[PDB]
Design a binder for these strands. Sequence first.
DNA 1: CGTACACCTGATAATGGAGGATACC
DNA 2: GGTATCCTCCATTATCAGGTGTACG
Length: 294
Amino acid sequence: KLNPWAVVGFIDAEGSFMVRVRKNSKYKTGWLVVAIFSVTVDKKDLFLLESLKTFFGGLGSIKKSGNSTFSYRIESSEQLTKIILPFFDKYSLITEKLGDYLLFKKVLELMGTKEHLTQRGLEKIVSLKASINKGLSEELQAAFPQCVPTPRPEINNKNIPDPFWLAGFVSGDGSFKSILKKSESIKVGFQSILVFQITQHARDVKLMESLISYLGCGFIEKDSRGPWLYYTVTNFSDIQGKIIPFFHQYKIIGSKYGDYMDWCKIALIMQNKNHLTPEGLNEIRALKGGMNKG
DNA sequence: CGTACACCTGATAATGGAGGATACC
DNA sequence: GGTATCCTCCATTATCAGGTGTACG
Ligand SMILES: [Ca+2]
Ligand SMILES: [Ca+2]
Ligand SMILES: [Ca+2]
């Protein structure tokens, strides 16, 4: 069952807050405006899509998205205003997704008021939409050559509001990795390595830097192929002593929870030093095999 | 012997859309 | 008609998931 701050964290990590402006000559302006809250998970996490649905009052639909993914969506601007806006105004996002939530919100305010059915309000909404995802499409850019994107919200210095935020966030983005690495000097031939790891776009560097002080361990690394950061923990005593305890109280949601549990099992084998024997190494090979699986 | 940070790489589940039909005022 | 919501489908990239090298105790 789902706690408000965990929903916020999860959504900081996995939601999209979208606005669409679609050409259709049946509308007086030539355009139909639509606002959409969307969360898309692999089919193994349908359970979690139904919880969110339940959490948000039984509102919205769950549908097939990709070849093996499902979306939970709320596309009624009325429902978004009554149920989504009051939850996220009270329980705020702290990543750059907040910018998009704020812009998304002004679009709905303008829809509340029918200013979307006017030429000026529509132009406002297109400027807003322009700052939600790196611009407008080719088509909208040309329909609206005159629009200056609404400048993005200055979203300074946001602390982790609650431990459940982090449980939620790691549930969406976050990996409990088990590695077996060739070793020339270990007697059994392989080193058993546990890594805790959060990936995020480099835009969220502040958040990523706050993870170090919040958990009292780890370090940031930049991916050399593009603008993405890793928060990494590889020190095993920080794993045993900080990360495992944290996620024991503040549990991961979705199927990834089964992965945390197996990673914990690997860690117990490591604490006892059984990873240094043939038997323990095989236990670990078998646990690692069933992770990302079932 | 064994560990841990700095560095490396490929695969795909999310990111963030899209369009058509239908329901509703 | 005008407007709002439901439904079905998709290209790319933000992750996610494996490694490796080698200094150091
Ligand atoms: Ca994410
Ligand atoms: Ca965005
Ligand atoms: Ca994710």
